[PDB]
Every structure is written in C-alpha cells, then in structure tokens.
Amino acid sequence: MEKEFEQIDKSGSWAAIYQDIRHEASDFPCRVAKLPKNKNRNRYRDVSPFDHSRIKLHQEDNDYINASLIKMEEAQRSYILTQGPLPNTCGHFWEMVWEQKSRGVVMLNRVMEKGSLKCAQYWPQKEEKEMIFEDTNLKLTLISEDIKSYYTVRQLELENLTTQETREILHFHYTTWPDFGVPESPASFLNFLFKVRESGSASPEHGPVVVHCSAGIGRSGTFCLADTCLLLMDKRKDPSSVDIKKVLLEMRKFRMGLIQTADQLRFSYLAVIEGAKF
C-alpha cells in the first residue's frame, strides 16, 4: 500500500485520484434536509444528510438533525457523522446521543479556529455550570476532564430529566489539527484514534460513536475512513487488498462529501499506512 502511495506522490496525482472519487460518489436525495423548516438546523447549506441514512430524532417535534448513520458492513462498525452543533441544535445533538445510545463523541475541531466559530460550545466547561436543554429535557454535567498535549478526554454525565436516568458519555476532543491543511505527520491523529478505540466507545455493545468536525465530512471523514480501513486490514486474509478509494466510496453512500480535499485524501492513506504497522 505504501507502494501505491509512493507512486501517487512520485507523480503528483492526488488531485486526480481525489476528483475521480468526487465524480464516482453516490448521489441520493436530501429532501428533508432542504425543507424550509430545517434551514436553521444546517450549518452549511451545501452539506446535508441523505434521507436514507439521516438520524431521526424521536421526540414529538421536527425530527431533523444534520447527522448520518454510516454503517460499514464488512468492517462491522457504525459511526454517526454530524456537523458541529449550532446554538439552537445542541439539545437536538444530545437528544441524538441519548436516543442512539452512543457512549463516545469524537470532536476533531476547536470551537474557534483561525478566529472563527466552527461549532457551538455544546458541552459545559465547568463542573458547577451544567447545561440544561429544556427543549429535549436533558441535563449535561462535566464530571472530569483529562487534558493531554494533543487531545482532551472529558467525562460527561448526560441525564434524561424526564426519567432521571443518567449515562456517562466520553468526549474525545482532538485539539491540535492544524489551522490550514492536514497534519504533516499522522502520529498524533493515530494515537488519538487508538485512545478512542481502547476507551470501548466504539464497542458494538453501545450505539454508534458520534464523530463531528464543523461540517461533519472533512476531518470527520478522515477519522472514520482511517478507522474503517484499519479494521478491514486486521480482518482480511490479504490486508493489502484494502482499497482506500473503494472504502471511501462505500462511506459516501451514507453521507455526501466525506474527505473534502486531496490533502485529506493523502493524509488518510498516510494514516492507514502508518497505523497498519502498529
């Protein structure tokens, strides 16, 4: 696989490989995402979930959230990819986490990047200042946080104020993705991915891990694509038969636009190449 990478670099065809993926990617309707009543539930009018794979909210209200269930059958893992919650969709976001029984939330952006807001402050920064989402009847409390040099893991308690039931949610926040471009090295990103794995958050006993960046297709796509390919390499008899392009096209049946740049495609290959050694 490093041989294919080398040939693509020693030729400069990443732009070519990437545009072919764009051309071959699935197109399915997003009728619900584009309904007028959902205008303010979408961070980017150009990034919408497909109707067939969108996550539906269960409460008696508009069921819409910009989130997609990516179900990877051969790798036997599901992910929920979603946009960075908006100030008016944080309650919906946590309702989704509750209803989908997710145990982990993976965040790949800072709330502020290059001086701009990519995401709402959707979890509490202080133990004593919990967040109440009156619309969806949820309370979210910061229990503790383990701040590391390249990522933070937070223990959150999500309480359904309706049943008084509580659940521990792990919040995995990769905090050092560069402002521009992709990490020169996949080392940190891979260490982060393995930390999420060993937390048990992506275990099949839980709901799908929720993964988001700002639009939920770029860095998020890199995360899911790398994780899925590494799973496929541990399963197949011929690990080098894993075709990253084919995997990405499979994931793009479930959410449009996964991997936003040729650089992100190149980084994904690099992350799988390096992650396979370990």
Ligand SMILES: [Cl-]
């Ligand atoms: Cl909200």
Ligand SMILES: [Cl-]
């Ligand atoms: Cl942040």
Ligand SMILES: [Cl-]
């Ligand atoms: Cl930077």
Ligand SMILES: [Cl-]
């Ligand atoms: Cl494959």
Ligand SMILES: [Cl-]
């Ligand atoms: Cl695209």
